[PDB]
Predict the 3D structure of the following.
Amino acid sequence: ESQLDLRVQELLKLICNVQTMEEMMIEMKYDTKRAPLGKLTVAQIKAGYQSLKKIEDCIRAGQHGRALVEACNEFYTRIPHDFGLSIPPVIRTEKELSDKVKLLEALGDIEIALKLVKEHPLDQHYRNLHCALRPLDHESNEFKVISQYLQSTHAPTHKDYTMTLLDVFEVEKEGEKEAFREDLPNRMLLWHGSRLSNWVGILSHGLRVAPPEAPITGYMFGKGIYFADMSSKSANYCFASRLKNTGLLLLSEVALGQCNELLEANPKAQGLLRGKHSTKGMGKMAPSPAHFITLNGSTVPLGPASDTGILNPEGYTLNYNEFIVYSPNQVRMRYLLKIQFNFLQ
């Protein structure tokens, strides 16, 4: 047996659970039976990404014929889906590419998590993370602020639930402090959400960019790292349910520097930086600078969401801001919130 504060123990038991990992993939229509997760290799994943590209190639060239059909078959073979008896859908839209990209991303973290769950077990894992998780003093000013930011930036559009801050752990990933690069302006504390089973991979490898094999059009603003100034915008990525009532969302410092403001999506946005250090999807609603506060050197956009005045002259107007940096060194994980979702029914 071994010891770590009970909170850190709870947290690990939550994100290390192999069952939940299985559950998550199944819930994503992934065939764990015909393709056991325990046998999933990093090479297989890279294979899937390439199949998608080929599919993106067809969609790109308007080839919705045999060319496409063969590409999907290849991919569905590479990444087995469980549709029961139903006939698999022929991927032929960007939105769907985007979903399959998120599936491969999850598999990538499952691969990582398992390759890590191999001297008390939890204590052993905590080490393998090379990431410090010190529980936070629920009386600290940090806590009060994290809580205020969390609630004050819960977007109106997301009322199908409520959030109760169970606990907060301060994160300290090896090497981020040093590499962070404090020279850039717009140093913000932003949200980032993800499913439970993803957290082991995020903690050990940190948040990272999409692979070069991946289809570019499966990324709203290119292969970068995404953040939001609205707690709920991110919490939706937890895909927590009434049974999976507990989820985790991360809060980290992002050196935005000069932002290249964009009204609408663009997978190729990274190319348009030309000096600016990040892309900003201009949302129709966001915190007001007048309500900003500073915490340990980073600006906290907590002010209740207000109208920004942005309005696409012809087209869809993004609801909330979208932030993207294309280099890990522009990110430094700080706090990891343990949240309990209270749905309505």
